[PDB]
RNA sequence: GAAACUGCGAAUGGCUCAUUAAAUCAGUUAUCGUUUAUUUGAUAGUUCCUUUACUACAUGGUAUAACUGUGGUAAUUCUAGAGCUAAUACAUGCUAAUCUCGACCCUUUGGAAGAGAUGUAUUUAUUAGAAAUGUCUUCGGACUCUUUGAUGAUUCAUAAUAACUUUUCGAAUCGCAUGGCCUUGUGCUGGCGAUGGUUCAUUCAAAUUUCUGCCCUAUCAACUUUCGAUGGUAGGAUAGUGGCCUACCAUGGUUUCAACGGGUAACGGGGAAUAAGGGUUCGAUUCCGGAGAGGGAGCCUGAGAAACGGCUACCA
C-alpha cells in the first residue's frame, strides 16, 4: 500500500520462488488480499511517468501468480460490469445501463485486459464468464449507444467510439494469441451476431486504408481452418465483404495484399463440408473478376509475387477447368506481363 | 578533506610544488558510497549548482535490458560475482559499475514463452551458454550505471564474447 | 588484446550474436581531420584503445606540433623532444633550448626512437600528456 | 477566497495555453508549407 | 576573485564610450544584456554623455521609468542595459529613433532613422541548430532564438528581423561581392565588398574586403558583418559611407 | 535608403 | 504602517604584499572536457483510461514567527515553558482536445461514414543520424520520384523503441480596470501588468588548459620512486578531464641545452628613471591579474566562499 516501498516490495514479495515468497500453504488465504490490492493501484490515472510506470508494474506481476489466481484478478475487472442480463435475454441492452458511467467502466476493463493480453500473450488464461463475455457485452453496448445516441452528445459518443475501437481491438489481440487453443463453438454464434453482423453491411467501404481490428480478425479466420465457419454464416457475408473491400475502386495496397494472402490460404487449405465448396468457388471468382485493377495498383514486387502464388494456387487446384476460370486467369496474367519461372509454369 | 587539486602532488621533473593557496570549495571531494545488496537506501546530495546527486547506499533492483531481442525488464539483484578493478567489492558484495552481478531468470523467462510460445522457431533460437544460465535459474549481468551518482543499478545481460570471456575468467 | 583484468570494449559498441552478419567484430573508427589519412591498419585493426585518435573517445583540437621521438620505453605512449633558438637581444645571439613533450600513442602507429611524428594536442590524457600522435615519418 | 478575480485568472490562463498551441501549430504548419515549396 | 564582479573603474571601461578620466573613479557597468560588456552601449551613456537629454544618473533614471525609451521595440528601465550594434531606440516623446551604428573612428554614433528603417534590424547568424522536438532555429548575434528558420539561412549570414513580431523577413548569404561592415579590430567601422573569405582548417579565417577607393584590407571573420549587396545597403549607413 | 533628414533660439532682455 | 516571516544581497567594494622562482604573471590557445544565480530571446492544450463512493467556485498543520502571558542567568545581537494566527514559507493535489489519411456525395471557400496517432525530467540498453529527353492539357498546369543539418573532426544536434525512478516539472500566487455576449442568470466570456516554472540559446562569470618567456648560486651533479614518482587497465570522486584517490600492473620521468637543492630587503605586469646607442636600475603604491585577513585545520548556507566586519577545533 505504501506508495515510495511499492515497487521494491512487488519484486521481493510477489517474485516466483522468492526467498520472501508467499508459501504454496499461505497462497489462498493470503492471494485475495493482494489481487484486490493489486486492483486497487490499477485504477490509477496515468498522468505522468511515474503513474504509467506503476500501472505497468501491476499488470508485469501477472505472469507470477498462478493462472486460477491471474483468472481471479480478470473476474475482479468484470464483477462491476453487469452483463448476465444480456447474454441471460436474446442480446439486448437495456436502457438504463446505456451510461457515461458505464461506458467509462469497461474502457477501463478492456484496457486491462489489452495490457493482460500484452504480458501474458498465449499464457493469457481465457474464460467465458470472466473475460470474453464482459469483453462482447462491451462491443455490443458500444454499438448500441452510437447508434441510438443523438449528435448532442459529442462526448458520450466520441467515448463509446473509444470502446468500440479498444474492444475491437481486443478481440482481435485475444484470437491471436489463444484462438488456436481456446474451443469457440458455444460462443461463436454469439461473436459472429453481436459484433461481425452489425458492421457487415458497410465493413467494404470502411477498411480500404490500412487493415483494421474487425479486417485483422477475418483475416485470421480465414487462415485458420477451424474458425472458417465463420466465414459460413449468412450466405458467406463476411466472405463477400471482405472482396467489397478488394472490389472497391480505392483500396490501397495495404489493404490488398493481406486479403489476396487470406484467399490463397482458402484455396490451400480443404475442408470436408458443403459450405467450403461454395466459398472457394464465391472466393475465386470475385477475387478473379477485380484482379487486373489491382495489380497496377501493387507498387511492390512482393505484393506481385503473392498475386502469382494464388494463381498457381488455382491451377493446382483444378479450378482452371471451368472456361470462365480459365479465360479470365489468362486476364489477370496478361495484365501481369503487360516470378517468372511461376509464370511460365502457369501458361 | 578530498581535495582533487594536481597542486600537492609532484612535478613531472620530480620536484615538489609549495602550497599555491589554500584548498577551494570549487575542487572538493566527497566520501564514497559502497553500495551494498540490502532494503533500498538513497539519499540526494547537494551539489554544485542547483543540481542534485542521489548516493545509492543499498538496492536490491535494477533494469537490465536483453540487447539481443531489444527489451529491458526490471529484475532483483543476486549478488556480486566478479568486480573487475578490487575484488574485495565482490567479497563484501559493493555494486559500481562494470561488476559483474546476478539477476533472477524470471522476468526475461516469461517474456521469451510469452512473445515466442516456445519454452519462429529459428527466431527462439538463442545462443546455447544463456539457455543453461535459463535453465540454472540466475543470469549474469554487467553493470552499466553508476550507483554512486544516479542511484540506479541499470545494466545490460553479458552475451557473445563478452559473456565467454568473463566466464573464462570465472 | 584480452591481457587485462576488464574486457576492453569500444563503449556502446553492440555487436548483436544472433543476426551473426559478420565474422569480424564490428569496429567504429572516425577521421581525425586536418588531412590526416587514417591509417588502415586502425580500420582492420583488432587492438582497443581509448585514447586512439581514431579508435577512441578523443578529439585533436588546438595546436599541432612536430618533434623527434626520444624515448618509446613506456606503454602506449613515447617522449618527444622540440628543440629551437631562443635570441639574446643584449649579445643579440641565438641559443639553444629544448623541451621533453610525453604523447600518447596508438599501437597503429609503430614509432622508433629517431623518426619525425607530427602530434595533435587533445584533452589531458593524464597527468602530463596532453597530445596524441597523429603522423609518423 | 473563491472570488471572481481569482476565476478571471484560471480562465485568463487557460486562454492563453490554448492560445500558445493554436499559434505553435500555425508556425509549424506554415514550415511545413515552405519546406513543400522548395522540395 | 570569489564571484562575479559588479564594479568597474573608469580606466578599465571600453575607451569607445568617451568618458571623462576625471569625472569620476566608476563608469556604469554594463548589465547582462544581449551583447558582451566590451562591445555595448549602456543606455544611461547614450542618454547622457551623447544625447545629452539628462545631466547625470538621476534624471536618466526618471527617463527611464517613464517608460519614454524603448529598445528593440520594447520598453526598458534598466539605466545599465547593455545596447548594443544594430539596435534600435526609440524616443517617441521627441519623435527620434536611433540606430547604434560605429563611426569610422569606431564608436558608437548617434545616426538618426526613420520609422519604416526602425521597423526592421539586421542580425548575423551565429548558429543553426535542430533544438527539442526536431525545429530548427538560428541564434543571432544580439541572442535571439527565431524558430523555424528558411534552411539556406547558414552560420555567418545576415537575417532581416521584423522588431514588432521578430520573424525573418529576408537574408543574406555570405558570398564574395557582398557589401559588409566591420565590428571589431583596428578597421572597426569601415565598410567594404568581400573578395575573398581565406579559410583555415582549426584556424580563425580571415576575409579581405575592399572599399569603394579600391584600398584592401584583411580581417578576422568574427568580425565581419553583411549588410547588403554592393551598392544597395539593407540599412541607412552613417555620414562618411564607413571610409578611412 | 536614406537617413532621416535633420531638423528653440535665444531670446534677449535688458533691464535696470 | 512599527515588528516578524518570506525573497534578494552580504562572495561586490576597500586594504596589504606575508607566502609564491614555470608557481603567479604577459602574450597566445582549447573546452568535441564542465558548472553558471541574474539579464535577454524562444519554449509545455497530452481527449480518454473501473471505487465518479469525485474539492477545483481552489486541499492540510502533517505550523510557526511577530504577538499575549509565566520565567532563568552577574553578564552577551543568550533564551526555556504555555497560548495564538498568515504565505509566492512548508506539504499535497484536479478540472469535451488536436493531427493524419480519407470511401461516399459534391465539383468548390467543399461536407465527412469511418481506419488511425498523442507530455516532459532521471537511468540503462538498442536503432537512425545516407533517356518522365514521356503523356495530355485550357497551354498555364497536372500525372510518377525526391525527403534531415552542422563541424576539420565526433558515440554531435535531433529522433525512435523497451523498461526504470523514496524522482522532478506541467501557475491552488498578486495589482489595476470593468469591456463583450446573450436564453437575465451574482450565467458565459474578456484587457493592461507583476511574480513564479521545464529545456535551449545569449550574457555576466568560474574551473582547468596548449606554446614561449623569469634574479643569484656548480665549492648544489645527479634527482624522483619505501609514504605516486612515469605510464597502462578498471573503479571511486567531481560540474567535469586527469595518479585527483583507490586495486593490479609494468619501470618508468628530468639532467651540463644546468635537472634537483639553496638564497632572494621575489607578488607579476602596464610602467618610471637614466642613456647618443647598446644597456643598467627601480616598479608596496591611482589600471589588470594572483594570494591573505594573528598562525594552522575543517565546514553550514547559498548559483557563486574553504568567507573570516559567517561558523567549529588547536597554538599565541
Ligand atoms: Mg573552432
Ligand atoms: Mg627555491
Ligand atoms: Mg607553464
Ligand atoms: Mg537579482
Ligand atoms: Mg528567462
Ligand atoms: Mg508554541
Ligand atoms: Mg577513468
Ligand atoms: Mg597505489
Ligand atoms: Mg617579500
Ligand atoms: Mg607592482
Ligand atoms: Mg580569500
Ligand atoms: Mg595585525
Ligand atoms: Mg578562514
Ligand atoms: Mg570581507
Known amino acids: 500500500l505504501d506508495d515510495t516501498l511499492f515497487k521494491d516490495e512487488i519484486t521481493t514479495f510477489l517474485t516466483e520462488n522468492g526467498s520472501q515468497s508467499i508459501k504454496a500453504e499461505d497462497e489462498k488465504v493470503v492471494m485475495p488480499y493482494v489481487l484486490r490490492i493489486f486492483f486497487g493501484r490499477a485504477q490509477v490515472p496515468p498522468t505522468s511517468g511515474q503513474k504509467r510506470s506503476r500501472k505497468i508494474a501491476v499488470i508485469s506481476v501477472l505472469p507470477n501468480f498462478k493462472k486460477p489466481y491471474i483468472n481471479d484478478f480478470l473476474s475482479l475487472a468484470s464483477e462491476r460490469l453487469d452483463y448476465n442480463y444480456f447474454f441471460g435475454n436474446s442480446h439486448q441492452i437495456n436502457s438504463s445501463k446505456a451510461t457515461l458511467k458505464t461506458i467509462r467502466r469497461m474502457t477501463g476493463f478492456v484496457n486491462i485486459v489489452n495490457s493482460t493480453l500484452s504480458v501474458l500473450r498465449t499464457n493469457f488464461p481465457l474464460h467465458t464468464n470472466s473475460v470474453l463475455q464482459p469483453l462482447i457485452y462491451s462491443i455490443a453496448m458500444a454499438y448500441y449507444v452510437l447508434d441510438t445516441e443523438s449528435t448532442e452528445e459529442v462526448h458520450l459518443r466520441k467515448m463509446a467510439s473509444n470502446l468500440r475501437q479498444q474492444g475491437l481491438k481486443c478481440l482481435s489481440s485475444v484470437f491471436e494469441f489463444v484462438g488456436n487453443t481456446f474451443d469457440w463453438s458455444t460462443s461463436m454464434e454469439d461473436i459472429y451476431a453481436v459484433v461481425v453482423k452489425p458492421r457487415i453491411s458497410h465493413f467494404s467501404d470502411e477498411n480500404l486504408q490500412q487493415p483494421s481490428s474487425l479486417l485483422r480478425l477475418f483475416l485470421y479466420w480465414a487462415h485458420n481452418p477451424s474458425l472458417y465457419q465463420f466465414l459460413y454464416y449468412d450466405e458467406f457475408a463476411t466472405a463477400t465483404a471482405l472482396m467489397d473491400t478488394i472490389s472497391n475502386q480505392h483500396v490501397k495496397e495495404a489493404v490488398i495484399g493481406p486479403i489476396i494472402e487470406a484467399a490463397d490460404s482458402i484455396i490451400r487449405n480443404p475442408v470436408n463440408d458443403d459450405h467450403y465448396v461454395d466459398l472457394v468457388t464465391l472466393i475465386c471468382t470475385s477475387c478473379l473478376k477485380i484482379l487486373p485493377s489491382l495489380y497496377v495498383k501493387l507498387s511492390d514486387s512482393n505484393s506481385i509475387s503473392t498475386f502469382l502464388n494464388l494463381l498457381v494456387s488455382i491451377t493446382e487446384m483444378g479450378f482452371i477447368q471451368d472456361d470462365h476460370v480459365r479465360s479470365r486467369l489468362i486476364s489477370s496474367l496478361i495484365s501481369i506481363l503487360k516470378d517468372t519461372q511461376k509464370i511460365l509454369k502457369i501458361l | 578533506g578530498i581535495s582533487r587539486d594536481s597542486r600537492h602532488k609532484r612535478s613531472a621533473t620530480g620536484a615538489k610544488r609549495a602550497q599555491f593557496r589554500k584548498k577551494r570549495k570549487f575542487e572538493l571531494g566527497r566520501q564514497p558510497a559502497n553500495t551494498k545488496i540490502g532494503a533500498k537506501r538513497i539519499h540526494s546530495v547537494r551539489t554544485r549548482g542547483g543540481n542534485k546527486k542521489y548516493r545509492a547506499l543499498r538496492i536490491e533492483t535494477g533494469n537490465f535490458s536483453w540487447a539481443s531481442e531489444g527489451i529491458s525488464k526490471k529484475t532483483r539483484i543476486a549478488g556480486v560475482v566478479y568486480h573487475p578493478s578490487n575484488n574485495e567489492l565482490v567479497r563484501t558484495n559493493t555494486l559500481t559499475k562494470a561488476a559483474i552481478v546476478q539477476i533472477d531468470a524470471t522476468p526475461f523467462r516469461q517474456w521469451f514463452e510469452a512473445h515466442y510460445g516456445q519454452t519462429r522457431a529459428a527466431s527462439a533460437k538463442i545462443e546455447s551458454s544463456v539457455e543453461s544460465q535459463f535453465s540454472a535459474g540466475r543470469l549474469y549481468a554487467c553493470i552499466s550505471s553508476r550507483p554512486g551518482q544516479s542511484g540506479r543499478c541499470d545494466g545490460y545481460i553479458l552475451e557473445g564474447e563478452e559473456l565467454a570471456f568473463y566466464l573464462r575468467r570465472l | 588484446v584480452q591481457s587485462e583484468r576488464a574486457f576492453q570494449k569500444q563503449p556502446h559498441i553492440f555487436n548483436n550474436p544472433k543476426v551473426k552478419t559478420s565474422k569480424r567484430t564490428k569496429r567504429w573508427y572516425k577521421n581525425a581531420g586536418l588531412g590526416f589519412k587514417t591509417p588502415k591498419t586502425a580500420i582492420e585493426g583488432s587492438y582497443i584503445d581509448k585514447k586512439c585518435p581514431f579508435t577512441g573517445l578523443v578529439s585533436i583540437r588546438g595546436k599541432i606540433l612536430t618533434g623527434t621521438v626520444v624515448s618509446t620505453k613506456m606503454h602506449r605512449t613515447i617522449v618527444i623532444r622540440r628543440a629551437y633558438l631562443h635570441y639574446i637581444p643584449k649579445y643579440n645571439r641565438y641559443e639553444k633550448r629544448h623541451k621533453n613533450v610525453p604523447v600518447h600513442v596508438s599501437p597503429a602507429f609503430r614509432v622508433q626512437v629517431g623518426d619525425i611524428v607530427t602530434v595533435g594536442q587533445c584533452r589531458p590524457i593524464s597527468k602530463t600528456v596532453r597530445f596524441n600522435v597523429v603522423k609518423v615519418s | 477566497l473563491v472570488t471572481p478575480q481569482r476565476l478571471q485568472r484560471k480562465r485568463h490562463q487557460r486562454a492563453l495555453k490554448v492560445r500558445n498551441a493554436q499559434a505553435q501549430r500555425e508556425a509549424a504548419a506554415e514550415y511545413a508549407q515552405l519546406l513543400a515549396k522548395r522540395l | 576573485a570569489r564571484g562575479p564582479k559588479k564594479h568597474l573603474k573608469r580606466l578599465a571601461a571600453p575607451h569607445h564610450w568617451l568618458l571623462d578620466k576625471l569625472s569620476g573613479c566608476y563608469a556604469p557597468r554594463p548589465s547582462a544584456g544581449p551583447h558582451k560588456l566590451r562591445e555595448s552601449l549602456p543606455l544611461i551613456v547614450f542618454l547622457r554623455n551623447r544625447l545629452k537629454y539628462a545631466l547625470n544618473g538621476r534624471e536618466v533614471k526618471a527617463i527611464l521609468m517613464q517608460r519614454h525609451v524603448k529598445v528593440d521595440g520594447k520598453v526598458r528601465t534598466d539605466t545599465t542595459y547593455p545596447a548594443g550594434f544594430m539596435d534600435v531606440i526609440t524616443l517617441d516623446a521627441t519623435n527620434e529613433n536611433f540606430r547604434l551604428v560605429y563611426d569610422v573612428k569606431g564608436r558608437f554614433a548617434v545616426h538618426r532613422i526613420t520609422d519604416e528603417e526602425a521597423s526592421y534590424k539586421l542580425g548575423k547568424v551565429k548558429k543553426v541548430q535542430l533544438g527539442k522536438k526536431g525545429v530548427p532555429y538560428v541564434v543571432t548575434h544580439d541572442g535571439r532564438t527565431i524558430r523555424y528558420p528558411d534552411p539556406n539561412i547558414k552560420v555567418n549570414d545576415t537575417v532581416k528581423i521584423d522588431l514588432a513580431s521578430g520573424k525573418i523577413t529576408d537574408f543574406i548569404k555570405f558570398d564574395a561581392g557582398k557589401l559588409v561592415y566591420v565590428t571589431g579590430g583596428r578597421n572597426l567601422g569601415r565598410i567594404g565588398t568581400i573578395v575573398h573569405k581565406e579559410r583555415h582548417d582549426g584556424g580563425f579565417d580571415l576575409v579581405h574586403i575592399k572599399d569603394s577607393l579600391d584600398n584592401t584590407f584583411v580581417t578576422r571573420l568574427n568580425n565581419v558583418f553583411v549588410i547588403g549587396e554592393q551598392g544597395k545597403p539593407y540599412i541607412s549607413l552613417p555620414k562618411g559611407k564607413g571610409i578611412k | ?16
Not at chain 6, 535608403?1 to 535696470?16: D, I, Q, V, Y
Open chain 6, 1 to 16: 535608403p536614406r537617413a532621416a533628414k535633420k531638423r528653440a533660439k535665444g531670446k534677449n532682455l535688458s533691464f535696470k
